[PDB]
Amino acid sequence: SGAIYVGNYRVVNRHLATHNDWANLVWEDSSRDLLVSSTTAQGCDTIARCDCQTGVYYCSSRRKHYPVSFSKPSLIFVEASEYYPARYQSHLMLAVGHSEPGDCGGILRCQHGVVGIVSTGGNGLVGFADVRDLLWLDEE
């Protein structure tokens, strides 16, 4: 589990979204496994605006933050998981590392802020849903 709290937005994995998230929906995209809902309180996370390929992610299933290199956000074929069939997922970045279903929502961060959240796992790889192209999270 986990979210990003920027401005009056909450960013979560679409497959973990709550009733309250859908009842306060701003934007969602199945293909990216992302959903954004509106918040009453201001959040304090900063979204990275960069093309970094190194950062640190939180892995709840190891209680550890791991430094990783990660790929450019792309359309990647993902194996079936407990929450999606095998499919193409867009705006996904891979690293070599551990990720199980409960790790979804863990933050990937670089020197510029939050890059994205854990979304995929298995096969010795971790996949992150990028948020750096969602420039509207910085305003409004």
Which residues does the annotation place in the binding site for Zn(2+)? 50, 52, 110, 112
**Lateral strand order in the sheet of 25-29:** 4-13, 34-44, 25-29
Q: Judge contact between 132 and 113, C-beta under 8 A.
A: no
Tell me the helices (H) and strands (E) count for the chain, helix number first: 1, 10
User: Is the CB of 35 or the CB of 113 nearer to Zn ion?
Assistant: 113
15: annotated active-site residue: yes
Clarify whether 98 is annotated catalytic: no
User: Between 15 and 112, whose beta carbon lies closer to Zn ion?
Assistant: 112
Rounded-to-integer distance, Cα 128 and Cα 46, Å: 17
CA separation for the pair 41, 93 (Å, rounded): 30
The nearest distance, CB 55 to Zn ion, in angstroms, is 7
Binding stretches for Zn ion (CB under 5 A): 48, 50, 52, 110, 112
Rounded to a whole number of angstroms, the minimum distance from the CB of residue 27 to Zn ion is 22
Smallest distance, Zn ion to C-beta of residue 9, A: 19
Q: How far apart are CA 88 and CA 44, in angstroms?
A: 32
In the bound state with Zn ion, the residue whose beta carbon lies nearer, of 70 and 81, is 70
Catalogue the active-site residues. 15, 33, 104
